[PDB]
Ligand binder design. Structure first.
Ligand SMILES: *C(=O)[C@@H](NC(=O)/C(=N\OC(C)(C)C(=O)O)c1csc(N)n1)[C@@H]1N=C(C(=O)O)C(=C)CS1
Length: 355
């Protein structure tokens, strides 16, 4: 645990925790490929349980990176193609607006304005079909990016259909297990509840509630140890033994679309490194519709990139960022949803300092 790392981490995180009034937090810094952990505060204020390297946090939208990689793996296995129309894996979507909408559009939020959230009233599989059949796109496919859980969420569900596995089974078997993410869950088992931190919203302890396409869009819970391991896997996919998974991780980091200085991958988002934090630039804007330029054909993962993803649930705030070229990365998990810009600022300050 190099004093340089200790020092920048503490000098950056302490002020952050105090300004944002965050109950508990865990940070991991990947340096020259090795992880270093830090923890503060409480996982459960009422029961005075401290945050540890085994505390599980709700990852929120950071879960989409797992989804993008599982999708990438399915492509590598020849089970699906990003150029395939959505209807190929859901024949019941007969509504004409779906014609030129492909799995690529779904995965990158470019289908034409799919909504940010699947409505609460959508429960059953039947309800989901009705929702997508009735949705009227605001734009032609491939012209604008509008971040949406209902978009990559459908991608995840369809991507695992030829496999015959449930999304959760495919994820556990093809991603979690092979990477030894043995304390990463879509559904927390009773035996692990002891380590599940509570999120805090306006002072109340809360956990994410069930929702349609939740697993695919924002339902993963994980530890700071497994997330550091997830970052390492994405920093150096070449060390991964499972071939389709290695390929899948690389596909998730390809640049499919460009908007401003940002590039859209599968789950992950990227910017060329070096980059100043002002450029990242990625926050909320309850919704920002942005025109996109197609990258034809997509650029393979660029090593000199700042690769990242933010995430939140009602009671948790998370962030992951890494730079392949420098074998550097960071994971910040907190049980309070706080401003995205404060996350990016903290991470940048730490990584820029270390390399
Ligand atoms: C990923 O983290 C996504 N978050 C959600 O879907 C949820 N909340 O997002 C916001 C918009 C911040 C909210 O408070 O409503 C959510 C899931 S389960 C639950 N209780 N809440 C997307 N993330 C962001 C972000 O920048 O945090 C978005 C702007 C779009 S939704």
């Amino acid at each position: 645990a190099p004093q340089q790392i200790n020092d920048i981490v503490h000098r950056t995180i302490t002020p952050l925790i105090e300004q944002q009034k965050i109950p508990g937090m865990a940070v991991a810094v990947i340096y020259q490929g090795k992880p270093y952990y830090f923890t503060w505060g409480y996982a459960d204020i009422a029961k005075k349980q401290p945050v540890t390297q085994q505390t599980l946090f709700e990852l929120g939208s950071v879960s989409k990176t797992f989804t993008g990689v599982l999708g990438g793996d399915a492509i590598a296995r020849g089970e699906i193609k990003l150029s395939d129309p959505t209807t190929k894996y859901w024949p019941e979507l007969t509504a004409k607006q779906w014609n030129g909408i492909t799995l690529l559009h779904l995965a990158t939020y470019t289908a034409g304005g799919l909504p940010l959230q699947v409505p609460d009233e959508v429960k059953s599989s039947s309800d989901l079909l009705r929702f997508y059949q009735n949705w009227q796109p605001a734009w032609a496919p491939g012209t604008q990016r509008l971040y949406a859980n209902s978009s990559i969420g459908l991608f995840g569900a369809l991507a695992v259909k030829p496999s015959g596995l449930s999304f959760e089974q495919a994820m556990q078997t093809r991603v979690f297990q092979p990477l030894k993410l043995n304390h990463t869950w879509i559904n927390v088992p009773p035996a692990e509840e002891k380590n599940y931190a509570w999120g805090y919203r306006e002072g109340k302890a809360v956990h994410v509630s069930p929702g349609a396409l939740d697993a695919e869009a924002y339902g993963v819970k994980s530890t700071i140890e497994d997330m550091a391991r997830w970052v390492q896997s994405n920093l150096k996919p070449l060390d991964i033994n499972e071939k389709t998974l290695q390929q899948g991780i690389q596909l998730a980091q390809s640049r499919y679309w460009q908007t401003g200085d940002m590039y859209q991958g599968l789950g992950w988002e990227m910017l060329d490194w070096p980059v100043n934090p002002d450029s990242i630039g990625s926050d909320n804007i309850a919704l920002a519709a942005r025109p996109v330029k197609a990258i034809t054909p997509p650029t393979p993962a660029v090593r000199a990139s700042w690769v990242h993803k933010t995430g939140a649930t009602g009671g948790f705030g998370s962030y992951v960022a890494f730079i392949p070229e420098k074998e550097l990365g960071i994971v910040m998990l907190a049980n309070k949803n706080y401003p995205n810009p404060a996350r990016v600022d903290a991470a940048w300050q730490i990584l820029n300092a270390l390399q």
